[PDB]
Enzyme design. Structure first.
Site, PDB file in Angstrom:
ATOM      1  N   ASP A  27       7.315  15.584 -56.819  1.00  0.00           N
ATOM      2  CA  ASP A  27       7.622  16.923 -56.426  1.00  0.00           C
ATOM      3  C   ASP A  27       9.119  17.125 -56.353  1.00  0.00           C
ATOM      4  OD1 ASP A  27       8.316  18.947 -54.176  1.00  0.00           O
ATOM      5  OD2 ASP A  27       6.187  19.335 -54.654  1.00  0.00           O
ATOM      6  N   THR A  64      16.391  19.833 -61.757  1.00  0.00           N
ATOM      7  CA  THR A  64      15.991  19.922 -63.168  1.00  0.00           C
ATOM      8  C   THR A  64      14.464  19.893 -63.287  1.00  0.00           C
ATOM      9  OG1 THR A  64      15.969  17.554 -63.677  1.00  0.00           O
ATOM     10  CG2 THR A  64      18.078  18.642 -63.810  1.00  0.00           C
ATOM     11  N   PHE A  96      12.720  18.931 -65.635  1.00  0.00           N
ATOM     12  CA  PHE A  96      12.283  17.779 -66.349  1.00  0.00           C
ATOM     13  C   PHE A  96      12.029  16.682 -65.368  1.00  0.00           C
ATOM     14  CE2 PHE A  96      15.166  20.165 -69.110  1.00  0.00           C
ATOM     15  CZ  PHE A  96      14.230  20.587 -70.022  1.00  0.00           C
ATOM     16  N   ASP A 120      12.861  13.429 -64.743  1.00  0.00           N
ATOM     17  CA  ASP A 120      14.065  12.732 -65.252  1.00  0.00           C
ATOM     18  C   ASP A 120      14.848  11.951 -64.201  1.00  0.00           C
ATOM     19  OD1 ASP A 120      15.083  14.868 -63.737  1.00  0.00           O
ATOM     20  OD2 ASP A 120      16.243  15.737 -65.369  1.00  0.00           O
ATOM     21  N   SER A 173      16.019  13.025 -61.485  1.00  0.00           N
ATOM     22  CA  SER A 173      17.084  13.821 -60.901  1.00  0.00           C
ATOM     23  C   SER A 173      17.153  13.570 -59.401  1.00  0.00           C
ATOM     24  CB  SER A 173      16.935  15.305 -61.207  1.00  0.00           C
ATOM     25  OG  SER A 173      15.609  15.733 -60.951  1.00  0.00           O
ATOM     26  N   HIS A 198       0.408  17.902 -48.783  1.00  0.00           N
ATOM     27  CA  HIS A 198       0.489  18.064 -47.345  1.00  0.00           C
ATOM     28  C   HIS A 198      -0.824  17.682 -46.651  1.00  0.00           C
ATOM     29  CE1 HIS A 198       4.104  20.979 -47.955  1.00  0.00           C
ATOM     30  NE2 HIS A 198       4.403  19.719 -48.207  1.00  0.00           N
ATOM     31  N   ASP A 238      11.498  15.523 -57.746  1.00  0.00           N
ATOM     32  CA  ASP A 238      12.105  15.440 -59.064  1.00  0.00           C
ATOM     33  C   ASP A 238      12.077  16.799 -59.772  1.00  0.00           C
ATOM     34  OD1 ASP A 238      12.746  14.764 -61.878  1.00  0.00           O
ATOM     35  OD2 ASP A 238      12.382  12.685 -61.298  1.00  0.00           O
ATOM     36  N   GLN A 290       5.084  13.103 -53.400  1.00  0.00           N
ATOM     37  CA  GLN A 290       6.272  13.740 -52.821  1.00  0.00           C
ATOM     38  C   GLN A 290       7.495  13.465 -53.713  1.00  0.00           C
ATOM     39  OE1 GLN A 290       7.570  12.564 -48.860  1.00  0.00           O
ATOM     40  NE2 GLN A 290       8.366  14.583 -48.405  1.00  0.00           N
ATOM     41  N   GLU A 317      13.852  12.911 -45.282  1.00  0.00           N
ATOM     42  CA  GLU A 317      12.945  13.790 -44.564  1.00  0.00           C
ATOM     43  C   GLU A 317      11.867  12.997 -43.825  1.00  0.00           C
ATOM     44  OE1 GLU A 317       9.429  14.445 -45.490  1.00  0.00           O
ATOM     45  OE2 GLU A 317       9.137  16.049 -44.001  1.00  0.00           O
TER      46      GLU A 317
HETATM   47  C1  HEM Z   1       5.283  13.354 -44.522  1.00  0.00           C
HETATM   48  C2  HEM Z   1       5.264  13.967 -45.691  1.00  0.00           C
HETATM   49  C3  HEM Z   1       5.913  15.289 -45.971  1.00  0.00           C
HETATM   50  C4  HEM Z   1       6.737  16.124 -45.244  1.00  0.00           C
HETATM   51  C5  HEM Z   1       7.257  15.863 -43.849  1.00  0.00           C
HETATM   52  C6  HEM Z   1       7.000  17.290 -46.036  1.00  0.00           C
HETATM   53  C7  HEM Z   1       7.800  18.375 -45.628  1.00  0.00           C
HETATM   54  C8  HEM Z   1       8.091  19.482 -46.408  1.00  0.00           C
HETATM   55  C9  HEM Z   1       8.935  20.557 -46.053  1.00  0.00           C
HETATM   56  C10 HEM Z   1       9.628  20.769 -44.728  1.00  0.00           C
HETATM   57  C11 HEM Z   1       8.997  21.408 -47.121  1.00  0.00           C
HETATM   58  C12 HEM Z   1       9.768  22.720 -47.218  1.00  0.00           C
HETATM   59  C13 HEM Z   1       8.830  23.827 -46.746  1.00  0.00           C
HETATM   60  C14 HEM Z   1       9.445  25.200 -46.925  1.00  0.00           C
HETATM   61  O1  HEM Z   1      10.447  25.522 -46.220  1.00  0.00           O
HETATM   62  O2  HEM Z   1       8.949  26.025 -47.751  1.00  0.00           O
HETATM   63  C15 HEM Z   1       8.199  20.848 -48.118  1.00  0.00           C
HETATM   64  C16 HEM Z   1       8.068  21.395 -49.362  1.00  0.00           C
HETATM   65  C17 HEM Z   1       7.321  20.802 -50.340  1.00  0.00           C
HETATM   66  N1  HEM Z   1       6.534  19.738 -50.243  1.00  0.00           N
HETATM   67 FE1  HEM Z   1       6.401  18.521 -48.750  1.00  0.00          FE
HETATM   68  N2  HEM Z   1       6.318  17.191 -47.163  1.00  0.00           N
HETATM   69  C18 HEM Z   1       5.686  16.017 -47.234  1.00  0.00           C
HETATM   70  C19 HEM Z   1       4.879  15.520 -48.223  1.00  0.00           C
HETATM   71  C20 HEM Z   1       4.633  16.115 -49.446  1.00  0.00           C
HETATM   72  C21 HEM Z   1       3.750  15.634 -50.397  1.00  0.00           C
HETATM   73  C22 HEM Z   1       2.923  14.360 -50.210  1.00  0.00           C
HETATM   74  C23 HEM Z   1       3.849  16.471 -51.490  1.00  0.00           C
HETATM   75  C24 HEM Z   1       3.132  16.448 -52.790  1.00  0.00           C
HETATM   76  C25 HEM Z   1       2.313  15.492 -53.167  1.00  0.00           C
HETATM   77  C26 HEM Z   1       4.759  17.510 -51.114  1.00  0.00           C
HETATM   78  C27 HEM Z   1       5.147  18.572 -51.873  1.00  0.00           C
HETATM   79  C28 HEM Z   1       6.023  19.567 -51.461  1.00  0.00           C
HETATM   80  C29 HEM Z   1       6.446  20.635 -52.388  1.00  0.00           C
HETATM   81  C30 HEM Z   1       6.009  20.846 -53.809  1.00  0.00           C
HETATM   82  C31 HEM Z   1       7.275  21.436 -51.698  1.00  0.00           C
HETATM   83  C32 HEM Z   1       7.994  22.660 -52.203  1.00  0.00           C
HETATM   84  C33 HEM Z   1       9.341  22.170 -52.865  1.00  0.00           C
HETATM   85  C34 HEM Z   1      10.246  23.290 -53.418  1.00  0.00           C
HETATM   86  O3  HEM Z   1      10.174  23.711 -54.621  1.00  0.00           O
HETATM   87  O4  HEM Z   1      11.131  23.801 -52.694  1.00  0.00           O
HETATM   88  N3  HEM Z   1       5.196  17.252 -49.867  1.00  0.00           N
HETATM   89  N4  HEM Z   1       7.617  19.695 -47.674  1.00  0.00           N
HETATM   90  O1  LIG Z   2      10.876  17.231 -47.571  1.00  0.00           O
HETATM   91  C1  LIG Z   2      11.531  18.401 -47.543  1.00  0.00           C
HETATM   92  C2  LIG Z   2      12.560  18.676 -46.519  1.00  0.00           C
HETATM   93  C3  LIG Z   2      12.217  19.405 -45.486  1.00  0.00           C
HETATM   94  C4  LIG Z   2      13.045  19.777 -44.518  1.00  0.00           C
HETATM   95  C5  LIG Z   2      14.346  19.406 -44.584  1.00  0.00           C
HETATM   96  C6  LIG Z   2      14.793  18.632 -45.614  1.00  0.00           C
HETATM   97  O2  LIG Z   2      16.111  18.276 -45.667  1.00  0.00           O
HETATM   98  C7  LIG Z   2      13.879  18.292 -46.580  1.00  0.00           C
HETATM   99 CA   LIG Z   3      14.071  16.655 -62.446  1.00  0.00          CA
END
Ligand code: HEM
Ligand SMILES: OCc1cccc(O)c1
Ligand SMILES: [Ca+2]
Ligand SMILES: CC(=O)N[C@@H]1[C@@H](O)[C@H](O)[C@@H](CO)O[C@H]1O
Ligand SMILES: CC(=O)N[C@@H]1[C@@H](O)[C@H](O)[C@@H](CO)O[C@H]1O
Ligand SMILES: CC(=O)N[C@@H]1[C@@H](O)[C@H](O)[C@@H](CO)O[C@H]1O
Ligand SMILES: CC(=O)N[C@@H]1[C@@H](O)[C@H](O)[C@@H](CO)O[C@H]1O
Length: 595
Positions: free
Chosen positions: A108, A184, A186, A188, A190, A351, A110, A105, A258
């Site tokens: 991700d 970013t 990268f 890094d 961020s 997820h 970053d 997470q 979150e």
């Molecule tokens: C309890 C753990 C976690 C919660 C509650 C959570 C919750 C969320 C939520 C609410 C979103 C936004 C969904 C949307 O509106 O499209 C999201 C996006 C994301 N989650 Fe998670 N997540 C969790 C764990 C993880 C894990 C473990 C990873 C990867 C190993 C991950 C990777 C991502 C990624 C890549 C996105 C899209 C980010 C973007 O470019 O906007 N998440 N997650």
């Molecule tokens: O983990 C991502 C996330 C999801 C929903 C609200 C937030 O402020 C952040």
């Molecule tokens: Ca970054």
């Protein structure tokens, strides 16, 4: 590219060329094309976007518009029929700690963030989405199917707002819509320092020339620091408990609170910056506030790169790691460093690794207090359990001694995420992350499963029997086709995750290719990659080579027993050693002589 280049939002930023440090925005990494990898630009398209109108309308928007001749199934229907399960017994990964999920997470956050569109604060349309479930403009509600229990308790839909896009924010009719990456590309840190100049300065402590990051002045953890509070209201961390009045943390990335274990790792990373900044000033008393901050920032960035590429990726990608991320052969200015839109869905494999509970453990790694184990849904936007209930140490021990969830074709996403998700502004622990993912797949105009298989050189099943063989699962394939009717229409998030994992890895062949390519690119396309000659001295590199997450724990908490390899499943006491057996980060190579 209808226009040879759309870029009205900040085209500006003078490049230094003499700077040993990264910009906060990511601009000027690539010398020829200085916007590449920078924040608040379009996510890269590795394949052309696929929208029902070719430009911006998501598949699923219009009842009467098929995808390849079939209606797309409701996101929540797919979630209920494919993604859900009841029995948490037996779902844990016998050889990945909870830290494995958690680091995913962090990485991700970053790399990517596509914020839900702006268009208004004071909105009649917010009510129209949430209260009335009417689809329009940026509201694209997740409709419940018949037979959904949530129909009986939660109304007709889950609200959902389309992601922001460049040339940005009202509708336009150009080449196809591209969603923004607000961070970013990268790797890094961020997420610690921010990707924008307003935030980055607000996070720093500029009241003293020590290059420290600002810390909470209201709460401490046994003399160790927490991040500052975010004092803008409404605050979801206040909303989940109005008695405690404990707001969210403020961190380089807006999502840091979150859930409690994300906030926990963010706190470790903040601590490490200041610890680094204090050692540097002691070793280099002459150094001013800026150089302290920047040298600390540079080190932490390398830490995240090393933990990620050395420890994390090999156990995600397994047998495919070599094929996609060979040994580093240097910085390559031809490589596209940008995060691709599909990667932001691929990396959502995490997820399926989130388990249903979080535990606080004591120094004997036994349950901390009578409510040591908590259901995960009570820990969304929960900072009060950190500040008022034992600090970081108990949670870090749980991160070390408890397990990630294993991805399982019949137990995909825990009900804590799939039925109980809390989203800020909405009031209930009642959302469905898997349905959100699917709906977002569509919002972003993702090509389907078979397009991505072709992209990755893999077979494109067209039949039930073919899909069974790829999934190695007849029942799953049959459920998916009953919903999707052609594998061509399967949404990439669910298609990729449904594949059996590769040997020694935790994702399937399609995701390994997608993830593999992206990670190869952010390494080879990063001018400030830690191993690039010129970035760190050879001596600084020999010291950086011994970083570990266990050492991060040891230096920044009062946890004194840790495992050598913190991503595998480790049991106490047999797999734990004293912190003295864990290598230190030798910072003597940062001692700069003068005269
Ligand atoms: C309890 C753990 C976690 C919660 C509650 C959570 C919750 C969320 C939520 C609410 C979103 C936004 C969904 C949307 O509106 O499209 C999201 C996006 C994301 N989650 Fe998670 N997540 C969790 C764990 C993880 C894990 C473990 C990873 C990867 C190993 C991950 C990777 C991502 C990624 C890549 C996105 C899209 C980010 C973007 O470019 O906007 N998440 N997650
Ligand atoms: O983990 C991502 C996330 C999801 C929903 C609200 C937030 O402020 C952040
Ligand atoms: Ca970054
Ligand atoms: C008991 C067991 O399976 N141990 C393996 C170990 O050989 C491997 O190096 C490690 C990588 O994290 O993953 C573990 O699962
Ligand atoms: C908001 C904040 O963090 N302020 C700290 C202050 O508590 C500390 O006394 C000072 C000097 O060390 O450094 C500042 O950054
Ligand atoms: C509903 C809930 O979570 N209530 C908790 C309560 O148990 C705790 O005593 C109080 C003080 O920290 O914080 C509240 O939020
Ligand atoms: C020496 C080297 O790295 N050559 C590669 C080359 O194979 C390719 O043209 C490109 C990848 O798009 O990146 C270059 O840097």
């Amino acid at each position: 590219s209808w226009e040879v280049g759309c870029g009205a939002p900040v085209p500006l930023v003078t490049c230094d060329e003499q700077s040993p440090y990264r910009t906060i925005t990511g601009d000027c990494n690539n010398r020829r094309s200085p916007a590449l990898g920078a924040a608040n630009r379009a996510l890269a398209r590795w394949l052309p976007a696929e929208y029902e109108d070719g430009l911006a309308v998501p598949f699923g928007w219009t009842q009467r518009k098929t995808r390849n001749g079939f209606r797309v199934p409701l996101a929540r229907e797919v979630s209920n029929k494919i993604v859900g399960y009841l029995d948490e017994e037996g779902v844990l990964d016998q050889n990945r700690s909870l830290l494995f999920m958690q680091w995913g997470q962090i990485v991700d956050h970053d790399l990517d963030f596509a914020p839900e569109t702006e268009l208004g604060s004071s909105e009649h349309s917010k009510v129209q989405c949430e209260e009335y479930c009417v689809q329009g403009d940026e509201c694209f509600p997740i409709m419940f199917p018949k037979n959904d229990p949530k129909l009986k308790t939660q109304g007709k839909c889950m609200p959902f707002f389309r992601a922001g896009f460049v040339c940005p924010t009202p509708p336009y009719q150009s080449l196809a819509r591209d969603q923004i990456n607000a961070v970013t590309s990268f790797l890094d840190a961020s997420l610690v320092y921010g990707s924008e100049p307003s935030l980055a300065s607000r996070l720093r402590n500029l009241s003293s020339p020590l290059g420290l990051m600002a810390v909470n002045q209201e709460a401490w953890d046994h003399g160790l620091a927490y991040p500052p509070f975010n004092n803008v209201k409404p605050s979801p961390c206040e909303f989940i408990n109005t008695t405690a009045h404990v707001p969210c943390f403020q961190a380089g990335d807006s999502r840091a609170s979150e859930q409690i274990l994300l906030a926990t790792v963010h706190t470790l990373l903040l601590r490490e910056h200041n610890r680094l900044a204090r050692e540097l000033k002691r070793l280099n008393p002459h150094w001013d506030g800026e150089m302290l901050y920047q040298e600390a920032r540079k080190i932490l960035g390398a830490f995240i790169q090393i933990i990620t590429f050395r420890d994390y990726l090999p156990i995600v990608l397994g047998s495919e790691m070599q094929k996609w991320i060979p040994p580093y052969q240097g910085y390559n200015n031809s490589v596209d460093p940008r995060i691709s839109n599909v990667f932001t869905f691929a990396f959502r494999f995490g997820h399926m690794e989130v388990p249903s509970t979080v535990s606080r453990l004591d120094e004997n790694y036994q349950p901390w207090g009578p409510e040591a184990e908590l259901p995960l849904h009570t820990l969304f936007f929960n900072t009060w359990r950190i500040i008022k209930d034992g600090g970081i140490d108990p949670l870090v021990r749980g991160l070390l001694a408890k397990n990630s969830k294993l991805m399982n074709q019949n137990k995909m996403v825990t009900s804590e995420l799939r039925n109980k998700l809390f989203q800020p502004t909405h009031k209930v622990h009642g959302f469905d992350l898997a349905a959100i993912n699917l709906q977002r797949c569509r919002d972003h105009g993702m090509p389907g499963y078979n397009s991505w298989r072709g992209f990755c050189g893999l077979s494109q099943p067209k039949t039930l029997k073919g899909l069974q063989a790829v999934l190695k699962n007849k029942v799953l394939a049959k459920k998916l086709l009953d919903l999707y009717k052609t594998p061509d229409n399967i949404d990439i998030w669910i298609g990729g995750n449904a594949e059996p994992m590769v040997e020694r890895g935790r994702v399937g062949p399609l995701l390994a290719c997608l993830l593999g390519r992206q990670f190869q690119q952010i390494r080879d396309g990063d001018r400030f990659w830690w191993e690039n000659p010129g970035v760190f001295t050879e001596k600084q590199r020999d010291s950086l080579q011994k970083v570990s997450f266990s050492r991060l724990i040891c230096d920044n908490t009062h946890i004194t027993k840790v495992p050598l390899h913190a991503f595998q499943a480790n049991n106490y006491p047999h797999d734990f050693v004293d912190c003295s057996a864990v290598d230190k980060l030798d910072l003597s190579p940062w001692a700069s002589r003068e005269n």
